[PDB]
Amino acid sequence: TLLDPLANALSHITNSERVGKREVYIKPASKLIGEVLRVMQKYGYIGEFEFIDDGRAGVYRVQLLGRINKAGAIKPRFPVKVSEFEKWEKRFLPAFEFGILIVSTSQGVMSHKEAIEKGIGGRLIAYVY
Amino acid sequence: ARMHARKRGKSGSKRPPRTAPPIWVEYTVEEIENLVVKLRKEGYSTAMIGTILRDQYGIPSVKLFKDPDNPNRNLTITRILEKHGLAPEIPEDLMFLIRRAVNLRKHLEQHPKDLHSMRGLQLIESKIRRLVKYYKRKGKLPKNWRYDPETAKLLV
Amino acid sequence: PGKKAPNGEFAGRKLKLKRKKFRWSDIRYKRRVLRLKEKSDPLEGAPQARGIVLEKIAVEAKQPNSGMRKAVRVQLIKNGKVVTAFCPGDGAIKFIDEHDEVIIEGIGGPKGGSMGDIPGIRYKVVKVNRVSLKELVKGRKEKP
Amino acid sequence: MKRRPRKWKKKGRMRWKWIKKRIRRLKRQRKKERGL
RNA sequence: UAACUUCGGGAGAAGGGGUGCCUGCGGGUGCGUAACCCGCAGGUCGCAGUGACUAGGGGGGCCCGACUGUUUAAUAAAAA
RNA sequence: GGUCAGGUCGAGCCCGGGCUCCGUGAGGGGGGAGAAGUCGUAACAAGGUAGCCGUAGGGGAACCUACGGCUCGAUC
RNA sequence: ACGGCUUUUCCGGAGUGUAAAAAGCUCCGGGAAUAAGGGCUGGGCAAGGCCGGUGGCAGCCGCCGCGGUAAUACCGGCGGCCCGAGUGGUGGCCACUAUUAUUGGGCCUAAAGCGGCCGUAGCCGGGCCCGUAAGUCCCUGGCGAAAUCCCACGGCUCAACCGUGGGGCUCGCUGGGGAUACUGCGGGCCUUGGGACCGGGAGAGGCCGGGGGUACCCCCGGGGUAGGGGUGAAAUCCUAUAAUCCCGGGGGGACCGCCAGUGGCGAAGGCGCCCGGCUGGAACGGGUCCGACGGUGAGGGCCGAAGGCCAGGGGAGCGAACCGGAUUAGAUACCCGGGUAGUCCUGGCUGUAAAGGAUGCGGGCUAGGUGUCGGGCGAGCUUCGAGCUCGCCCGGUGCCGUAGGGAAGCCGUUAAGCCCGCCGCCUGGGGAGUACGGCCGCAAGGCUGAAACUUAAAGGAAUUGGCGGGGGAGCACUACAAGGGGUGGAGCGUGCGGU
RNA sequence: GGUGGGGUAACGGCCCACCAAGCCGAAGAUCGGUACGGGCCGUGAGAGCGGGAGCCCGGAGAUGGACACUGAGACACGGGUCC
C-alpha cells in the first residue's frame, strides 16, 4: 500500500521529466509536499504549482521547466547536525552547492544551504538537482 | 489489491466534492433523522438504510449535514442510531462475518470433504480475528472478548 | 526481485543479524573464525619446520607436462607427522641423504597449497644439515 | 532431498536420477552395515 | 538411573544417603485428645537400630528358541 | 601450649555420573587423484527407442519399464 | 690515461665529554687510501630473438605457460633492467574485493524466490486540527588521565627525538535553557487504502444425490467356415470343444469424444456428459455502511499431481515385476502375445515434481497499436431474440512495439524500467545433499546439515565453420535406373606385402 | 522476594530460622568454544576490517590447591602450615 506520498511525488516528477512532460499531478496532497514544492520553486527547479480540492487529501498541479536532472526522497530520514553536511552533499550531489538537500528543521523545511546559514540542523527528507 | 485474492477491482463510489447539502434536498435534518429511525425500526442495516434513503427519498447522503448537537462533527447513520439508542451492540460488519462463518461451519459439518469451502471459512475467520483485534484496540468491545466457534451461535 | 531489506530507521538489529547470518557463507571468514586451518595444519601454523628424511621419492609431472620431480619424505619433530617436501634445484636430490635433518618451508602455490605441475606436495626443502640448499646446489658451500 | 538443478545437465556426467538411486542404495547399505 | 528398543520396556538397571529409643509439636479422614496413617524439632545409647526373625548380589559380550506353556511316571526339562 | 569433645573452611585419595578434546583398532564403505587397462555405448544431431525431473520395481555397468509432469524438442 | 683537490668515513694523537669509561664533539698528522651486494631478464612487468650445454631427460613455473635437435622461458658466459646497505623466500592481517554490499552486490536462461496460501512477534505504515518535548536540532556548565595523532615556533647541525601553545581522539555520559518541521505519545475530525452491504449477470471453483453417452470386455442363443491376430519380416498366441466376423439378449468397471478456443474458474496442486440441493471466491454498477481497521511476515498452521503405505471393497481396458515369441556377436531393452501390484470407491498416512511465468508479495509513475472473456454506458441495425455491428470506462487473458533495461536471448503498463516496504535465498566447480547429531513418519522416505582432501576452471548468451541414420533445392556413368563388355575361378607378364 | 536475626569496617541470601513461588529465557537463558579489558597499533579515499606482547591505567598469579599469625594495609614472589 501507499507508504510515502512525498517519495511517490518525487519519483513521479523525475519519471515525467525524463520524458519531458510539461505538467504533472501529485496525489495525494500533503503540507510536507507543498513545502517541498515551495522550496523547489524558490530555487527555480519547477514552475507554477497550485492546490486543488477533490473531497480527499487533495491534488497538486505542477508545471515543469525542464530543469530537474533528478529528484528523490531520502530515507531513512537521517538526522544531521550543522557540521555534518559535507558527507551528505558528497553522497547525494555531483558537485559542491550543485543541488539542494531538502531538510526538515525545527523552524520549518528549508534548503541545506539555508540551514547552514541559520546555523541549525534537522533531518534530511529529500534531495533535488 | 484484494485482501486474499490479490485482485485489483476498482468498482466503487465516486461522489462529487461537496461541503454543504444540495439545495434540492426536500427533507430537513430532523425529517431525515426520523426517516433513519423509522427504517431502523423496520429492521434494515445501516448500509441498507443509507441505500434506501439515497434511492427512494433522494437524499444523497446524511454525512453532508452538520450535526446540530455537535458543530465539530457531521451527521452519520450510526451516530443518529446511537443518539436514539438503537446502534448495534457489536459492529455490523463483524456480525455479518460471524453469521456467514457460522453458516459455513454448519454446511461443512454435513460436507466434510469440501476443502475449498473450508479454506473460505479459514479466510472468513482470519478477517473476523482482524476486526476483533481492531475493535479491541479501539475499545469498542470488552478486552477479554474472544471469538469462539461454539459461542458464536448464541450471538447469531 | 525487490528493494533490499530491511531499510527502516529502526531496523538496525535485523540488519546486523542478516549481515552476521550471511557472513558465514564466506569461506575465508568461516575458516578464520573457526580456526579450521590450525586444527589440521601439520606445521601448527608455523612458517617453517624441521624434520628427518625418511626416504627419497619422485613424482610424475602432471599432464600435459612430463618428467620426474625429486622429493623426500620428512618426519616433523613437532608431532612426528610425515609429509612430502619437494627438492628445488637442478641436482638437489644428490645433496640429501637418508636420516638427515632438513628444514622445510611452505610452497608458494595458490592459497597455501601445491604449485605448478606437482599437486600434492605443499612443502619444499630449504636447509639440509643446517646449510642452505641453494648454496649447496650453486656449489659455493659444502654439505657437512 | 534438497535440489541442485545444475546436476541434471548431462554434459560429462551420469543421469542425476540414477545417481540419486545409487546414493539411496548406498545410504541403506551403510545403515545396514552400521547396524541401524 | 545407561546401551538398546517392537516406545509398552529394559527398571527394583547401575549407583548413593537414612533407619533404634525417649520428650513434645504439626497434617490427613474423622463429632471426638475414638481408630488408622503421614511429617517436623530436640536429647540420647551401641561395634552393630530391616540389631532376632523375615529379607534380590551386580554388570558386559556371543549361540539357540520369539514369549507364557508341554515332554521320556523310574539316569536326558533341553536348542526338543 | 598438650589431651578430649563439638562447629566450620577444607587439600589429597577412592567410587559413580555428565561434557569437550586428543591416539590407535584387524576389517568394511564409498571419495579424489593418477597411465598409453577389460565390457559394452548411456548423453551431445530426431545421438538411431527425444531428453529430463518425482515415485516404484528391475538389470554386470552405463539405463530398462510403468504412472503424472516440463521443453532445457528436431520433423510435418 | 695524465695533472690536481677534500677527508664525511679509515688509522694515530691532544682536549672536551662520563660517577669512572666508552660513544659523540673541536682540533692536528697520513692518505682516494678502508668500504656493493641482492633479485630479475616471454607476458602480467623495466630489461636479449645474442652466444655454448641438455633434446619431454634434467629442469622452470605465484597464474598463463616453456623444454620432443633449431630453447630470448632450463644450466652457464657476455650484455641489460629494478631497488641498493639492503635484497629475495615462507606463514599471517588489510587493500585488491561492489567476492559480505547501511554508504554499496545479486536471485527468467550463469549460485540463488520457500510448491502455494493464512497468520504471532518484529519492521514498514493515508490526510487535517490541537497538546507534551521522549527521539531530533541549537546554546550553555561537569566530564571522557597522560603518552600516541595534526599544526606553528623554539632546543639537540636540520631530521628522527624532546619542550611550549592550539586542535583532534577516547565512537559517548550527564545538569539546565530554547525550538516543534519530522518521529513517538494522548485527544479530536475525515475517506482516498482495505473491509461490510445491496442489484443484474459470468465461470470445467468445491461437496452430495439422481438420471444418461457411446466405446471396450465377458457370458448365453442364432448364421457361417478355416482361419484370426501381429510385425520391417516373423514367431509366441486364439481357433475344429466351431475361432475372426454379423445378428438378438444379459452383466460389469473405468472415461465423458467433436463442439474446445493465446477460452473460462481457482493461492497453488488442479478442475469438462445432463438436471436438483448446499457452498466459497472474484469482476462490474453503487452522492450505500465503518472510518487506517493496512503490507510483509522469522517461529507456527492449512492445503498439496503422480507414485508409495495401512485397513476394508472393486477390478472392464491399460500395465512396473514376471513369464514366452522375435532382433542382435550378446539384448537383463526398444518390437509382439499374456500378466500381478497399481490405476477406481470408503477412512487415514506419506508431503514429494521441469509443483517452471525456472520470474515472491502490496503501492505510485513511465508512447502507442491490435485480438479475445465478463460487466457497464452511448449509437446504428434487427427476424425485437439473453440477437448483430461500432465506440468508450473498469477488470482478466495473448501478440507486436516506442523511451528505457540487459552479457545477450529478450522484457517493455501482465517490466526483467525509476522509486517507497517486508520477508526468503546466493557468495568458484567437486567432495555433497554425503558423514555425524537431532526432529518428524508404520516403512519408503522428509526436514536440518558439515569437514579433511581435490580442482582452474565449472557455468551463461551469442558468432563462423564442420557435422546429423533433420528439412528443402540441385548436380555426377571414378552414383544409381536401362543396357554393352568385363574382373573375382586357371597358366603366365609385371608391381606390391611377407620370408 | 519478604519478616526477624548473626557476621562484617560497611549494605547485601553473605549466612541462619520462618513465610510464599517466585527469578532468567528465541530481543538467544543455560550450556559449549576462544580470550586479560582499555588508551591504542596495522591497513584502507572513506565507510570498514583485523590485532590488542613491549609504553600508561586497571585486573589477576607466584609449581597445582587449601589455610591461617603479625600488621592500617596480606590470607603476603625473595615470611608461615598441610596435601
CSV table of C-alpha atoms (C1' of nucleotides) in Angstrom, one decimal, chain G residues 44-173:
chain,number,residue,atom,x,y,z
G,44,G,C1',51.2,-9.7,-16.4
G,45,C,C1',56.1,-6.2,-15.5
G,46,A,C1',61.5,-2.4,-16.8
G,47,A,C1',65.1,-5.2,-19.1
G,48,G,C1',68.5,-10.2,-25.2
G,49,G,C1',65.2,-13.4,-30.6
G,50,C,C1',72.7,-13.0,-28.6
G,51,C,C1',76.4,-17.0,-27.8
G,52,G,C1',78.0,-22.6,-25.5
G,53,G,C1',75.4,-27.3,-22.9
G,54,U,C1',70.7,-31.0,-22.3
G,55,G,C1',66.7,-33.0,-26.6
G,56,G,C1',59.6,-34.4,-22.8
G,57,C,C1',65.7,-36.1,-19.6
G,58,A,C1',67.5,-32.6,-16.5
G,59,G,C1',64.5,-28.8,-15.2
G,60,C,C1',61.5,-24.0,-14.9
G,61,C,C1',56.6,-22.4,-13.4
G,62,G,C1',52.5,-17.4,-7.5
G,63,C,C1',48.9,-17.6,-12.9
G,64,C,C1',49.3,-18.2,-18.3
G,65,G,C1',52.6,-21.4,-19.8
G,66,C,C1',58.2,-23.3,-21.7
G,67,G,C1',61.5,-27.9,-22.7
G,68,G,C1',60.1,-33.5,-28.1
G,69,U,C1',67.9,-31.4,-32.0
G,70,A,C1',66.9,-25.3,-34.2
G,71,A,C1',65.2,-23.1,-26.0
G,72,U,C1',65.4,-14.8,-26.0
G,73,A,C1',61.2,-19.1,-20.8
G,74,C,C1',66.3,-24.9,-18.1
G,75,C,C1',72.3,-24.5,-16.7
G,76,G,C1',76.4,-21.3,-17.6
G,77,G,C1',79.2,-16.8,-20.5
G,78,C,C1',78.6,-11.7,-22.1
G,79,G,C1',75.1,-7.8,-22.1
G,80,G,C1',70.7,-5.3,-20.0
G,81,C,C1',66.8,-3.6,-16.1
G,82,C,C1',64.6,-2.7,-10.5
G,83,C,C1',65.9,-1.3,-5.9
G,84,G,C1',70.6,-0.6,-3.2
G,85,A,C1',73.3,-1.5,2.8
G,86,G,C1',70.0,-3.8,1.6
G,87,U,C1',67.8,-7.5,-1.4
G,88,G,C1',65.0,-12.3,-2.0
G,89,G,C1',62.0,-17.0,0.1
G,90,U,C1',57.9,-18.8,3.5
G,91,G,C1',53.3,-18.0,7.0
G,92,G,C1',49.6,-14.1,8.9
G,93,C,C1',46.4,-9.3,8.6
G,94,C,C1',44.3,-5.1,5.4
G,95,A,C1',43.5,-3.2,0.2
G,96,C,C1',42.8,-5.7,-4.4
G,97,U,C1',37.1,-7.5,-3.3
G,98,A,C1',30.7,-3.6,-5.1
G,99,U,C1',33.7,-11.9,-3.7
G,100,U,C1',29.9,-9.5,2.6
G,101,A,C1',27.3,-4.7,-0.5
G,102,U,C1',24.0,0.9,5.6
G,103,U,C1',27.2,4.1,2.0
G,104,G,C1',27.4,-0.2,-1.8
G,105,G,C1',26.1,-6.6,-4.6
G,106,G,C1',22.7,-10.4,-6.9
G,107,C,C1',18.2,-14.4,-7.4
G,108,C,C1',13.9,-15.9,-16.1
G,109,U,C1',18.2,-18.7,-19.0
G,110,A,C1',25.1,-18.4,-15.2
G,111,A,C1',24.7,-19.5,-7.3
G,112,A,C1',20.4,-18.1,-5.6
G,113,G,C1',12.2,-16.7,-4.8
G,114,C,C1',10.1,-21.4,0.3
G,115,G,C1',5.4,-25.9,-4.4
G,116,G,C1',1.2,-22.5,-2.6
G,117,C,C1',-1.6,-19.7,0.9
G,118,C,C1',-3.4,-17.7,6.2
G,119,G,C1',-1.3,-15.6,10.1
G,120,U,C1',2.2,-14.5,16.0
G,121,A,C1',6.3,-11.2,17.3
G,122,G,C1',9.3,-7.7,14.6
G,123,C,C1',9.9,-4.0,10.6
G,124,C,C1',7.3,-0.6,7.4
G,125,G,C1',2.8,2.3,7.6
G,126,G,C1',-3.3,7.6,4.3
G,127,G,C1',-5.0,13.3,5.1
G,128,C,C1',-6.2,17.6,8.5
G,129,C,C1',-6.5,20.2,13.6
G,130,C,C1',-4.8,20.7,18.7
G,131,G,C1',-1.3,19.3,23.5
G,132,U,C1',3.8,17.1,25.6
G,133,A,C1',9.3,17.7,24.1
G,134,A,C1',10.6,11.0,24.5
G,135,G,C1',13.5,10.9,19.8
G,136,U,C1',15.9,15.2,16.7
G,137,C,C1',18.5,20.3,16.3
G,138,C,C1',20.8,24.8,18.8
G,139,C,C1',23.1,27.2,23.1
G,140,U,C1',25.4,26.7,27.8
G,141,G,C1',28.0,24.1,32.9
G,142,G,C1',30.7,19.0,34.8
G,143,C,C1',33.3,15.2,32.4
G,144,G,C1',35.8,11.3,28.7
G,145,A,C1',44.1,10.9,32.6
G,146,A,C1',48.9,11.1,30.3
G,147,A,C1',51.6,9.2,26.1
G,148,U,C1',50.0,8.5,21.0
G,149,C,C1',47.7,11.8,16.3
G,150,C,C1',47.9,17.0,13.3
G,151,C,C1',49.7,22.2,13.1
G,152,A,C1',53.2,26.7,14.3
G,153,C,C1',57.5,28.0,17.0
G,154,G,C1',61.9,27.0,19.8
G,155,G,C1',66.5,23.1,21.5
G,156,C,C1',69.8,18.8,20.2
G,157,U,C1',73.6,20.7,12.9
G,158,C,C1',68.1,20.3,10.0
G,159,A,C1',65.8,15.4,10.9
G,160,A,C1',64.2,11.3,13.8
G,161,C,C1',63.6,12.9,19.4
G,162,C,C1',62.3,16.3,23.1
G,163,G,C1',59.8,21.3,25.0
G,164,U,C1',56.0,25.5,24.6
G,165,G,C1',50.9,26.8,22.7
G,166,G,C1',46.3,25.4,19.5
G,167,G,C1',43.3,21.4,17.8
G,168,G,C1',41.6,16.4,17.4
G,169,C,C1',40.8,11.0,19.8
G,170,U,C1',38.6,8.3,23.5
G,171,C,C1',32.6,6.1,18.7
G,172,G,C1',30.0,8.8,24.4
G,173,C,C1',27.8,10.2,29.7
